[PDB]
Amino acid sequence: KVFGRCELAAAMKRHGLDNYRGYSLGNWVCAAKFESNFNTQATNRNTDGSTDYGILQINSRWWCNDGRTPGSRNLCNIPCSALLSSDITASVNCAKKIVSDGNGMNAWVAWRNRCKGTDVQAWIRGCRL
C-alpha cells in the first residue's frame, strides 16, 4: 500500500506514534516519506547482507527475521514480511521498540539526514487526522 501523507499521519496517530518518546507526528511522517516514500512494500538490501523492510525500513540484522541475515537478533520478534503489510501495526510496534533503544530516531538514516532539525510539522499541515 502506498499511503497518502495525511492518511499515514492519521494512521500513525491512531497507532500511538504522535509524541511517542517525545517525537512529534511530523517526525514520523517525514521519516516514512524519506525511508519508503510511504510504500509499505519497500525493501532495500544493505551491504552487510541485511535488508530493510516496510514504511520505516526496519532492518533484518537487529529487528526482524528474514531467514537470510547472519547474526540476526530479531529484537522485534517478527518475520520481516510482517513489516510489508497494508496494516501498519507491526511496523509501528517495532518502531516503538527501536526508538526506545537509546539512539532515538537516529536509528533511521533518512530521519537523521533529512528530517532532524527541520520544520517537521509541515508534514502534517492541512491534515484532518
User: According to the binding rule CB under 6 A, does residue 107 interact with ligand ATP?
Assistant: yes
- 81: DSSP letter: G
Instruction: Tell me how far, at minimum, the Cβ of 121 lies from ligand ATP, in Å.
Output: 21
Pick from 44, 77, 89, 121: which binds ligand ATP (CB under 6 A)? 89
Q: Which three cell numbers stand for residue 97?
A: 521498540
Contact 83, 91 (CB under 8 A): yes
Catalytic residue among 7, 35, 48, 87: 35
Nearer to ligand ATP, 26 or 61 (CB): 61
3-state secondary structure of 118: coil
Asked if residues 15 and 89 have their Cβ atoms less than 8 Å apart, the reply is yes
- 3-state SS class at 112: helix
Output the smallest distance, CB 66 to ligand ATP, in A: 14
Please state the closest distance from residue 129 (CB atom) to ligand ATP, in A. 10
